[model samples]
Target: LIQRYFRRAHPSAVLGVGDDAALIQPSPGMELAVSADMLVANTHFYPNIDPWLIGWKSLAVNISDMAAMGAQPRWATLTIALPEADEDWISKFAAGFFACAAQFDIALIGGDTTRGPLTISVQIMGETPPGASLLRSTARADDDIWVSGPLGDAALALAAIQGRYPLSDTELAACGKALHQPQPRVVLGQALRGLAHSALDISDGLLADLGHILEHSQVGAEVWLKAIPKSEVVSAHSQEVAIQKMILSGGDDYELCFTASTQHRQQIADIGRQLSLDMAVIGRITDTQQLVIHGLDDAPLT
Candidate 1:
């Protein structure tokens, strides 16, 4: 839902949304981007999901989109539809919402409420300096693809949701918690602003989401399977589960998946060391348009 719309008006606008009302502030050396997303009970998340966490994730995902575009998220509006006016739910939701807003310095400007099943929709605004916004179409040939932290914890959590795995109490709790709460790559995206040739946070499976970068960059890549990081939980699991975690065919691992040039590889390493962030240079760009993967021994995994 967050990826559906075009970057919207803030500094300057010709037209956007339901009405023919769109205008930019005409900031001399800046541009703006806007985005929106929806989350529904039992559709996007479980019914028992924490209301506060839900509020935070809804905002975080939207802000991630702005960050991918190298924009600074500034304001947002939330529209919610609920089955009943439960004060407990509202209080928790507001608390979580404010917690995230304060972290990003975002403001809850305005929105609407309605009657229905649990649903939350957010529209966000952001801005960047002139000629500095990142775009998917800007990926160049001969770049190195990278991903932050581990993959698959979120997907393992999803499997737990479906009762596929009879996990122990601790494992069950970890898996369940991950599904309920996804951390967006706010800091990493901010760091990649000038370094990344093209970038986006992974929401869908790794193959599909990274496929977007491959398609737009018009260059192929060979991913190193062993270089991909996963949590101890995933590594200790079965071969099948471990593989699924790597692919993340589903579930949200909102890590920053981006590309940099070969020359920037050492600089990237420096950045990772300084931030103490676990970032991996998983693959290198090729002239062909086919995406590939290889094992530790350099054999093609694809």
Candidate 2:
């Protein structure tokens, strides 16, 4: 079932499906980067979530990990456990899966399927120049902290669904769109290879993931609350405190947050311009071992 549904040409593969294991040959002087993620119904996603989106996000999340390392995605393997064999559901799911694969120019080379509760797992592989891959522990005290795009939309959508907040139809729709279909910053990550010293995608909350970088690098950060980028939906409906908290602590953004030397500011800005993405410098690494957030009044956020 998987062979017929998922098999595709992988030029770098010595052996694809119909074999014990897929064989891959990495290009000379390049290192392989691999990442995997698992999603289950009613846990990572709502039970009624669209199957297409499930497939898209399953692959997208792993690709985002590769992007965090500034790698060019090359191949992916999917494993799914479905309660039943619904042809229509499978067809739509594959459509979404392949759509993302096509967008990133990656091949779906192998996978496994089984009968069980709805669960999706994807493992992705990419290539990066040896010694050029970004590392979370490479951040320096004076490096600038930047995010690839705005935050909190996906979290706001979840809040709206759970009745924690109210949103207009348009706002809900916009938030829902972001929640369901997140764009992994693949190209931007690749462009940042030599420019960014440390990077990672925002899967958990910004504070949490950025905390990982700080923990590894033994550094601290001072984020300007007033400078955090937000979407029109979040800015319109959320109070200042709520917006600040959600943007900082919200998850599922899949956007890349990275740190670069102060000297590369202009080059980084140019890259954002070239990609037509809004890269916001929200903070900088500090020598002190703490994550401080400065509020709009220029006072420390508790």
Candidate 3:
């Protein structure tokens, strides 16, 4: 039954499905960026969440990695360990995975399954122009920081679901989609290849994830807390430390965060409108080895 779900073929694959491994050729003169991510129940995700969410997110996060590198997703593999061979559960899981795979035009070339605790791992590969893929370590001082979408919504959903945060039924649905159906910024990734100096997806909260770019690039940043993007739903919670706490430290928002030259700001906004991204410019790279902070009024916060 597992084989029936995972075994498949792709045009690029010389061999596919359950074998020792899968082999596929990449596009000519293109560099391939590959990444893998695993979701463990009660850790990356709450077990009570829908299996469909598990399947969809399992692949989406991998896509996020490829997107961060400004690559076009082409191939993927899935490995799942579930508590049982429950047929209905399996169907929902596979359907959600396939839904995301089909949307991205990513082919599932190989995978594995076994009886165990619920865990999902996905590996994805994408093609990018040779020498043009963005890197986290390449950011330069004076480059502006940008995020593909608003932050903190997914953290809100998690808190509400855990009974730690309260929200209306309508509110939950709005925020829940951010956690449940994270859209990997693939097009924006591809668009950023010549523009962004460095990039990564925000899986570990905005500040921490942005820290990766800062550390690897050997630079500091001045991020305005007020510049962190938030939706109207999040605004209600931003008073005091409510939303700000989650905005700064909560994880699971997989939007792309990237650095680009200050000069590219206009084209950046051009692409934002084309992509319909909120496209928040939250901060800028700095020479000083300090993580400075501020609010929207340009007042120092830290």
lDDT of each: 0.71, 0.84, 0.83
What lDDT is obtained when candidate 1 is compared to the true structure?
0.71
TM-score of each: 0.82, 0.90, 0.90
Off by over 4 Å in 3: 1-21, 43-45, 296-302
**Stretches of candidate 2 exceeding 4 Å from the true structure:** 1-21, 43-45
Q: Please, what are the lDDT tens digits per residue for candidate 3 over residues 1-302?
A: 44554433222221125554477888899888989877777755457657678778888888999989999999998777767758777677888888899999998878567667777778888899888998999989999999888888999998998888898999999999998889999999999989999999999987788889888999999888787778778877787477788887788899998999989999998999999889889888999867787864667754
- The digit string of per-residue lDDT tens for model 1 on 1-302 reads 36644333232111112322233343567677778888877864456767788777778778878877778777787777767867677667777877887888876665456556787888888777766766776677788888876777777776666676556777767655546566656656667777889887777766877888888878777787677766677656635734554454555777777888888888888887777777888887778888777754667745
- lDDT ranking of the models: 2, 3, 1
Candidate 3 or 1, higher TM-score: 3
RMSD after CA superposition, every candidate: 6.9, 5.1, 4.9
Identify the superior model by TM-score, candidate 1 or candidate 2.
2
Model 2, residue 251: distance off in Å is: 1.2
